[PDB]
Amino acid sequence: GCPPHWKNFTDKCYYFSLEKEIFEDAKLFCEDKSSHLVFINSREEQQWIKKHTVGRESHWIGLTDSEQESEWKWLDGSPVDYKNWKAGQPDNWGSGHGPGEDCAGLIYAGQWNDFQCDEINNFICEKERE
Numbered sequence: 001g002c003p004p005h006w007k008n009f010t011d012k013c014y015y016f017s018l019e020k021e022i023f024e025d026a027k028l029f030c031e032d033k034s035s036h037l038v039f040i041n042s043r044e045e046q047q048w049i050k051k052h053t054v055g056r057e058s059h060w061i062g063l064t065d066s067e068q069e070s071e072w073k074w075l076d077g078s079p080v081d082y083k084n085w086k087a088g089q090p091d092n093w094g095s096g097h098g099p100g101e102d103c104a105g106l107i108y109a110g111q112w113n114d115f116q117c118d119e120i121n122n123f124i125c126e127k128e129r130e
């Protein structure tokens with residue numbers, strides 16, 4: 001029920017990018033597809049996503065704390081509920097010389113980590129099946 005290149009999970013469609021881009025460019029790419037950087041709302045969605053992203057590349061998800069440091073929300077303004085940060089993260093590395101890390105992404109085993117938004121990562125788009 002999803003366009004080619006997209007994977008289905010329940011009634012949603014996901015795109016696991018081959019493209020590598022900084023956060024804002026990733027956000028823009030999904031918007032051009034009438035989708036948004038993935039919002040992970042449950043352990044089941046997290047697990048399904050995990051199996052489609054094993055590999056060395058990291059994947060941007062639609063979560064940031066740019067508006068207010070430590071206040072993580074999805075792009076649609078929804079406050080983070082379900083969470084899967086790796087222990088010790090988010091650490092806002094480098095805050096002493098800049099804005100730190102305000103963009104979230106999936107790393108090993110699917111855990112979340114905060115990156116500087118100018119880091120080049122793969123990404124995941126999400127949208128409704130039509």
Ligand SMILES: CC(=O)N[C@@H]1[C@@H](O[C@@H]2O[C@@H](C)[C@@H](O)[C@@H](O)[C@@H]2O)[C@H](O[C@@H]2O[C@H](CO)[C@H](O)[C@H](O)[C@H]2O)[C@@H](CO)O[C@H]1O
Nearest residue numbers: 086087088089090091092093094101107112113114115116
């Ligand atoms: C063995 C090692 O240190 N690997 C490096 C990554 O660091 C690990 O993963 C991060 C997410 C933390 O859990 C570290 O404690 C752990 O050692 C390292 O990842 C970067 O770590 C930064 C903190 O030192 C920060 O969290 C950043 O967001 C994260 O990307 C990567 C990239 O520098 O290199 C591995 O070698």
Ligand SMILES: [Ca+2]
Nearest residue numbers: 039040041126
């Ligand atoms: Ca979702």
Ligand SMILES: [Ca+2]
Nearest residue numbers: 069099100102
């Ligand atoms: Ca910040």
Ligand SMILES: [Ca+2]
Nearest residue numbers: 065092101102
């Ligand atoms: Ca931050």
Ligand SMILES: [Ca+2]
Nearest residue numbers: 091113114115
């Ligand atoms: Ca980090």
